[PDB]
Design a protein around this ligand. Structure first.
Ligand SMILES: *[C@@H]1O[C@H](CO)[C@@H](O[C@@H]2O[C@H](CO)[C@@H](O[C@@H]3O[C@H](CO[C@H]4O[C@H](CO)[C@@H](O)[C@H](O)[C@@H]4O)[C@@H](O)[C@H](O)[C@@H]3O)[C@H](O)[C@H]2NC(C)=O)[C@H](O)[C@H]1NC(C)=O
Ligand SMILES: *[C@H]1O[C@H](CO)[C@@H](O)[C@H](O)[C@@H]1O
Length: 278
């Protein structure tokens, strides 16, 4: 627990077509999503809640590849480069809904847990409904930015508390979320379903910092140079050969970049999302 993996990078083993699709599904959460029958790649938009002001927009889709896909917006309801003394960045226990499912000493960042907790009843209800409606057993969770950390928590909660568990999770520009205990519990419960994707010089995976007790789960795929198709996998937790070997840029350019031919441009990107356009 709390280590840094020193093993070498390996070729990217992920399904780049699924990553490209997932990227589209989350870009679309930055756009109004109540137009009926909207199609993003292989997927149909079924349902939306939130709006990216009080709560992150969450879209529910049906995909033949990904099943019932839950996509969580990550717009700046709070900012991740602001004063780290703020209560948003404090570690806290798991919420009483699911603390029983986690190891003792698990800690999560208040800001992400709060924001997930405001959506979690509605996510569960809509997922359960559209699984029944579409006779679909697979649940895919997708997030970007703030919504990537919320989405990791959602992914876990689905695996622990929902019938059928989780299929896959695809997370883009994932901030840190929990402590070493949480991150090792992610590896152990959803490690084989976990896909963290980082683009270029993106700074967001470096916050909140490890000196405040935060730790990523094992493995990410890092696209370098930013926006290209050149990418490797950096295995284990907090790989020393990964992203800190190249200087972070302190803007959202690469964060809101091209991930396997699909842009996640955020609020000022493409609406509707266009899978495989770039
Ligand atoms: C990888 O792909 C990314 C696109 O998905 C690239 O990100 C883009 O990078 C450029 C410059 O590096 C950014 O352009 C800047 O935009 C600011 C925004 O403020 C202005 O917003 C409106 C937009 O129309 C404008 O009219 C006003 O003047 C505002 O002031 C400008 O102020 C700057 O001059 C600057 O040009 C893009 O915004 C950014 N796109 C996104 C979606 O974030 C990235 O650079 C690519 N990386 C590599 C390595 O190739
Ligand atoms: C990186 O290097 C360390 C030794 O310094 C090992 O513990 C690890 O297996 C990896 O080779």
């Amino acid at each position: 627990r709390g280590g840094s993996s020193t093993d070498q990078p390996v070729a990217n083993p992920y399904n780049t077509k699924e990553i490209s699709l997932a990227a589209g599904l989350v870009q679309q959460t930055y756009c109004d999503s109540t137009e009926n029958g909207l199609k993003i790649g292989d997927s149909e938009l079924l349902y939306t809640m939130g709006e990216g002001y009080a709560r992150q927009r969450v879209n529910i889709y049906h995909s033949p590849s990904l099943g019932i896909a839950v996509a969580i917006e990550g717009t700046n309801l709070f900012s991740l480069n602001s004063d780290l003394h703020d209560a948003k960045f404090w570690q806290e226990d798991p919420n009483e809904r699911y603390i029983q499912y986690y190891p003792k000493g698990t800690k999560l960042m208040h800001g992400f847990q709060q924001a997930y907790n405001d959506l979690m009843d509605d996510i569960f209800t809509a997922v359960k409904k559209y699984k029944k409606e579409k006779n679909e057993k697979r649940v895919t969770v997708i997030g970007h930015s703030l919504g990537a950390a919320m989405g990791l928590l959602c992914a876990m909660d689905i695996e622990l508390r929902m019938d059928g568990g989780l299929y896959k999770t695809y997370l883009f520009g994932l901030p840190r979320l929990g402590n070493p205990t949480f991150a090792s519990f992610v590896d152990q419960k959803i490690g084989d379903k976990f896909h963290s994707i980082i683009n270029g010089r993106d700074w967001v995976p470096t916050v909140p910092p490890r000196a405040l007790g935060y730790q990523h789960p094992s493995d990410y795929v890092w696209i370098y140079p930013g926006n290209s198709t050149s990418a490797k996998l950096y295995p284990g937790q907090e790989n020393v050969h990964g992203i800190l070997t190249v200087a972070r840029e302190f803007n959202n350019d690469d964060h809101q970049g091209i991930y396997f031919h699909t842009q996640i441009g955020a609020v000022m990107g493409e609406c509707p999302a266009q899978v495989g356009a770039h």
